[PDB]
Structure formats: C-alpha cells, structure tokens
C-alpha cells in the first residue's frame, strides 16, 4: 500500500499568515508561536508572508488572495474571538470557519485554524504569560504537515512524470 | 551578538538509540516514540543505530561504545526504572544519571535522557495507551536540537576556517 | 609581595553565556541582567556568545564547548532549577554543580554559576524588577573578575617573559 | 536500521570471575552458579579465570587486571555484602558499585555485578539453593549476553571493515 | 628502613596562598597568621604568591593555576564558609574539598586546607589569639612540612641521581 | 580451571607505608602492627618505606607518590580518625576512602585501607590491643596476599612468555 503524509520540515516552503488586530494582547502571543515553529522546524523567515487586518470579519477576504499567489504553499489563519459581542461570535466564527473551508476545497491549498475561541478571557491570561500551549504554535505545525503533504502528494504527481 | 540555538530538522543526521529490556511493555512504547519524532522530523530511519540490553545497569557500558563511532551524531538514552528493589533504584538510577553525564562531557557528544521514573507499573501502562506523553518522543527531540546545535557549534567552527 | 586580583572592566574580553529554556519566564529576566553588567561594565556586546538549550540537563555539555574555543575567556552558566521532580532537582543540580566544576578545573577557564534555585515564581519577580538582586547580574560580575584575574595571571605570565 | 541484542551461547568466549573470600559460606553457592551457566550455556570451563581475594574491598583492583588482559572477554563480579559493619557496607558497596562502573567505561569491557546485598543470613540462604535467584547465575547470564553483544559490536565493525 | 618526613624551615621555598573575600573581617585575620608562621620559620615573604577572589566557589580554579607554576612548591587554601546559604555550604564546601583534593593528587603538588568552618562568628574570633588555632597558622605549617617532604621525596630521587 | 590466590610469604616484596601523625596515641601501635606482620611473615624491612604526614587529609597525595615508584609493590594506608569535627570526619574519611581507591585502579597497584574509623575513643582502645586484631597487623597481611597475588597475576603473565 502507498501511504502519504508530511514530515514537519519547513525546508523549501513559503508560508502565509493572516491575523486580526482585535485583542492584540493575545495575538502577539499567537503570531510568535507560529513563526517559531516555522523557523525552528527549518523554515527560513524571508518567505513568511504576514498580513494584519482590523477585525475577525475580514480574515476570509484576505486569505482568499493569499492562497491565490502561486508561491504560498499553505496559509495560517490567526484570529481571536472572546465572547465579546455574541451575535458576532456565533455568526462570524461559524462563517469564518466555513469560509476558510471553501477556500481550501476550492483553491486546493491547506488553510489552518489558529483561532482562539476563548469562552473566557481567563484562558487568554493563562497563555499570555509563558505557557507553551500556543494555538499558533500548533496550528502552524499542522500547516507544515499539510504543506509537506501536498508537496508530497503533488510531488509524486509531477516527478513520476 | 552570536546566538546559537537548535533548529529541529533531523535532516542528514545519524542517531544512536540505547534501550533496556526491563519492563518492555512500555519500552517498546517509548522506542516507537523516539523513531517517530526522528523520521517525522525529516531524519531518515536507515542511519538510526539501536541497541538493547538486559536491564538499566548496562545502559552506560552500551552508549560508551555507540558514542565512540564517528558516524553517530547523538545518542538517546532509553530505559524504564520502576521502583523494583530499592538498592537498584536509588543506586542504579543515580549511576545511570552520573554515568551517562560523564560520557557526554568526555566524548563531547550529546546524550539524551529518556528514562521514565514512574513509581509503579500502572502509570507505565496508562502512558502507553492514553496520551502522547511519551518521554521517548521528547528525549528524541532534545537530541535533535542538540544535534543541530553542536553541528551548529562545530560546523560554524569548521566552515569559518 | 605579589598580589593578583581582577578589576571590574569588561574591556578586551569575550564571554560565554549558556541558557536553559525551562521556566523561560525567569530566564529572560536573568540573561537580561547578565548582559546588563557586561556591556555596562566596559564590554561591547559584539563578543558576548549566547548558546541556548532545552532544560537544565544539557547545560554542561554546551559550556564545555564554549570553553574549548580559544576566544571565549569566561562562560556565564545560567539556568533555573525549581523543585519540580525531586529526582531531577537533587541529582541534576549537583551534576551541574560538579559538571561545571570539573570543566573549569580541567580546561583552566573560569565558569561561573548563575543558577537560581527558587521555589515560587514570586521569588523570581522580586529579583527581576529593581531590587539589584538579579543573580545572573552577580554571576556576570564574578566571571568578569575571574576573566580579568586570569588575564592578570596569564598576562603577568607572558609579559614578564 | 541496525539492531544489536545478545544471544546466550557462550562458545568462543573467555571469562573473568572475581570473588571475595569473606562470608564464603554463601559465596561457594554462587561461584558454582556462575561457572554453572558458563559451562552449561556452551562455554568450556578451561578458559574461566577465577581470582580470589580477602574482602569485598579488594574486588575492584583485581578486576582491573582481569579486564586488562586481551583474552578475557567479560569480568563477572562475585562478592557478598551482608550488613556486618554498617560503615563498611554503605561506603564499600557504593564504592565497589562505582569503582566497577568506571572500570567498564574506561576499559570498554563489560563487567557484571554478581554481588548479593543481604540484610540477613536468612535471605542469603533462600536464594543460594535452587530458587531461581542464584545471583551468580544471572550475573553470568547477562555477562555472556554482553560478551556476544560486544563481540557482536566490535566484530560487526571489524568484520564489516 | 627508609623514612621520610619534613622539617619546618621555610628557607628556600616559594608558597601559594589563595584567599576568598567572602567574610573578610576574619579572613584578614587568617592570612596574617599564615604569612606570620611562614616568615617566622625562616622563609622570606617576597616568594609568597597571594591571590584574591570573591566567594568560596572560585577557590579551586585559582589554585589550579598557582600549582601549574614551576616555582610554587605548595599552595595554602584559605577561605571561610559560614552557613550563609546552606545549599551553598553543602555543595560549595564539599566541592572545595574534592576539587582541591583532585588537583593536588593530579599535579602531585600539595595543597593545604586553610578552611575555617564556623557556624557562629564568635568561635572564629576566639581561635585566632595566642593559642594558635589560627587555622591559617596551622594550614601554613602543614604546607611547610609537606613542602619540605616532597622536596624531601623527589630530591632524595634527583640528587641520588 | 585457572586459579590465582596468594600465599602469605613476604619474601621478595618491597612495601609502602603512609602514616598520619594525628592521634599518634594509636598510630605508633598500628605502624608497628604492620612492620611486624611484614617481617614476621618473612619480609625484610630495608625494602619497607615509611612516610609520615600531618593528618588524614594528606594520606592520598603521599600514596600517589609511593605507588608511582617502580620498586614498591603494595602500599599500606594508615590513619586514625576520631569524630573530631563532622565536616572533617565525614568529608575527609570518604574523600580519602574513594581517593585511595581511585589511585589503585589508576596506578594498578594494591592499596589496603589501614584506617581505624572510631566513633568514640573507646573503640580506639579496643582495636589497638591484644586480641591480635591490630588493624595494622591485618591490613598489612591483606597487602601481602594482594602483593603475592598481583605478583601471581603479572608473573603468570610475564614468565609464560
């Protein structure tokens, strides 16, 4: 049987990061954690492409362009939703969840979810200190595994050629 | 500033693995943990050199050989010490720690400590089937980071020459 | 009479700093203090050599490398050990105490002990702000004196020649 | 991947047996146990080398010579530490354990602890009969295992060269 | 029989003195007593080498240089450890014992142990008056005797030569 | 089976003796104890060598000198430690204990531990008495048995050639 998955090497890969700037105290935390696991897993940072946006709403629209550049292999979602504004949390979080979903299925490119849905800002003051449970860290890793996967999937597509 | 830190790509490295066979219900579990983090951090699995021995006692006399090979860049300590005979847990666990340490200083070669000090066997059974808590995975990681750090130390020496 | 001592100038000198990343909450604070004393007490930071590692275990093996390079005059050992796991604070801390010791005596090179043994994060914060008690600050001072002292030993050796 | 472990046939091998002559009441039972499994796991007994000495103290210095012969492959250790004299029991048992440990690392030649640490004459007699626990028996077994493991080690290096 | 012991004449001998300046109120008391007995037993005070360091920790690394001079026949260990920091008194004091021990055994050059272990400062001040428990007085005298002894040992070798 | 042990005939052997002169109230007794067992076991005394030092501390460095001469076959530790100060009895007894041990493994020369570690002055009165348990008598004999043994080891090596 033929198995496919990705090792976690960030070698030869160019990454995408989008991030809100609502609640930037904790977003500072997540951006770091992602960028680390990139670079410390071999990634060079000159090809990480990073976009800020105002609020959670605009995360889709931006990622949509980011994934459409040829040279961005995977794109890392980053946004923060604490239960501040409830209609905007149920509708916008499910609409971004879905929105990202369609972007990937359509564009044929992995998009990770580094979106901290903290019911309680008390969970946010826990990781803003020093804890490594850094959702940016780990969603960044999943993006690498996908990245090397579709690098591995489509490489066996075009080298067998 | 000159900063040296370990990046986690196991690319091009040849690992040393030393294993006890006392309590192998869980040692088989740990060695898996090490090999996985190894290859799934980009290292190849043909250049892993694995050795087993009766009990934790000969762990040192083992690695003393493996580390003297020029083509093994790091040695991973593996064993399980469950509190079986207190003469053997206080004195042998202390001799493992002290013994492996002196090898490392002496050969100038990173040796990792994957020894599980569990108080009983039921904790050993729990960790081999309920969580990724896998001390082998992690001693496998620290030797990777040391492998690139020392290959960063001595190679920043050798090419700058 | 002939008396040898060392002033507190960091001029003409190249230092080593070894850093663990366990409990990094406090490590940021102490390496900061350490680099404060060097550059403020006459040193330029261009020859401060900073090597980082996982946990307290790997401290020795690193400094032993920093001491085998010709142009590192003193190495500032820095890490935090907190009473987590009694197996690891007793045996690992004395193995650091001893391991560093026999390093310097063998290599004939001063290595100082900036290892804060604390029981609470609050004991770390107290020492981080302004209480002039950053123990890395002091370890940086002691090593400066030893560096200029050994520069005073070795230079009064080669100049009288 | 390459695996090394250890088979139990003692053929082609030449052993070292070092033994105290204090408490020889139970020592007679172990010496027989040792040469029992050697001859009985295929070894001939003409190449067994038996050195007797005063008390558990002289154990190391003797083994030091036995391992320094080319045609002695493994040095099985035989001594009894019954709680007679407590300063001699803690200080000399840990110093035998340590002194042996360093001997094996230094000479890169396997050494086995066939030393029965008993608090009573009752525990000494029980296992010295036929209850599967004649510590000389397992000492000689693990020693054969490291003999074929090391001959598997260095002979897999020297023959693959 | 061939017996060797040393007289106490300080004539023709060049000494080492290492001094911690932790607790200097009594340390000055000591070195006075030291150089006193040296000079009174006929030896000139210009061949004294006196080295100053911070706290008890560096005591080793200083002497290690002092001995590697061809022209220092013996070295006088001088420092005071008062129970200030008990982790620092167990590890530093014992490490002073061992570290100095092994330097002397290694260089085959004697190092005395002018170490005052006081719990209370009053027991210090009481012992430097005229009864000459001025521990430096005695550690100085031991160094003289050992000095003449190794000059008695090796010189009964090189002149009989 | 190849067996090595030793007769007790001191014919042809040249011995080493180191003696502390602290508490000479017992040291004279033991010193003579060894000389007796030597010559009354056939050995001449023009080949015995006695060195005297201040205290228990210096016995290591001396034996290291005595064992390095070509014409000394075995060395006799001699000292009495009375519990005068717990820093000096615990540290100096274990430090000389191990210290002598490592000398022997290192110089490949047998050292007997001719120490009387008495917790009280009464135990000091028991062991230098009439019952022919004169620790010097005994450790002298252990040295002769080990002297003829390593003469049996190295002779069964050198003459078989």
Numbering used by the authors:
A (entry chain 0X), B (entry chain 0A), C (entry chain 0B), D (entry chain 0E), E (entry chain 0C), F (entry chain 0D): 1 to 161
Q: What did the study's authors say about this model?
A:
One highly versatile encapsulation system has been engineered from the capsid-forming enzyme lumazine synthase from the hyperthermophilic bacterium Aquifex aeolicus. In the structures of the AaLS variants, the pentamer is the common and exclusive building block for all assemblies. Here, we elucidate the structures of the AaLS protein containers by native mass spectrometry (MS) and cryo-EM single-particle reconstruction techniques.
The best variant, AaLS-13, possesses seven additional mutations that further increase the container's net negative charge and enhance its ability to bind positively charged proteins both in vivo and in vitro. Like its evolutionary parent, AaLS-13 has a highly porous cage structure constructed exclusively from pentameric building blocks, but, in contrast to AaLS-neg, it adopts icosahedral symmetry. The 39-nm wide, ∼6-MDa large sphere is assembled from 72 pentamers (360 subunits), twice as many as AaLS-neg. Its internal volume (15,600 nm3) is 3.7 times larger than that of AaLS-neg (4,200 nm3) and 58 times larger than that of AaLS-wt (270 nm3), accounting for its enhanced loading capacity. The AaLS-13 cage architecture can be best viewed as an extended dodecahedron, the dual counterpart of an icosahedron, with each face consisting of a central pentamer surrounded by five others (12 × 30-mer). In contrast, the AaLS-13 assembly is not skewed, and its porous surface avoids offending contacts that could arise when a pentamer is packed inside a pseudohexagonal hole.
